[PDB]
Amino acid sequence: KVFERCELARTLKRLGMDGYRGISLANWMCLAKWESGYNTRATNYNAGDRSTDYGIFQINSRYWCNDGKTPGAVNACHLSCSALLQDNIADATACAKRVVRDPQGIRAWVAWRNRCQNRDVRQYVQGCGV
């Protein structure tokens, strides 16, 4: 599924993402925007280390989900990476929450650092009713 902007903002809010561990909804939106263009079936293979990024947040298989083909990988979210390719993003948000409970928080995603950190991200939630 490819979410429309405000549709996603309210979907994330309903799943408890607004302010989760001090991270604003606008930040999660900016993350999803730059990671996959709000596309839940987005995937990216990383030839260098044999891991794959999954879903709307492009979560990596080396540490977060199990795809069975990533060498020495772990599954901290305790999910099959397939769960991160669903139209329903409940599991993907559960895992995104798991990621941010770690020390880095939202900084876990380099894309967030490159396009969201210290940026005016208000535009992501404007007019969505969140």
Catalytic: which of 7, 35, 49, 102? 35
In the chain, alpha helices (H): 5-14, 25-36, 90-100, 110-115
CA triplet 5, 11, 14: central angle to 5 degrees?
Answer: 145
DSSP per-residue string spanning 97-116: HHHHTSTTGGGGSHHHHHHT
Backbone angles phi, psi at 125, to 5 degrees: -110, 0
Using alpha carbons only, how large is the chain's radius of gyration in Å? 14
CATH for 1-130?
Answer: 1.10.530.10
Experimental method: X-ray
In Å, what is the CA distance from 87 to each residue of 28, 36, 112, 125?
17, 13, 22, 21
Burial 87-105 (b: 16+ CB within 10 A, else e): eebebbbebbbbbbeeeee
Residue 60 is encoded by which pair of tokens?
């990596």
Q: Distance from CA of residue 95 to its chain's centroid?
A: 8
Task: Say what the resolution is, in angstroms.
Answer: 1.8
In the block, which residue shows the tokens 């879903």? 55
Are 17 and 93 in contact by the 8 Å Cβ rule? The answer is: yes
35 is catalytic: yes
91 is catalytic: no
Q: Distance from CA of residue 63 to its chain's centroid?
A: 14
Catalytic: which of 49, 53, 67, 120? 53
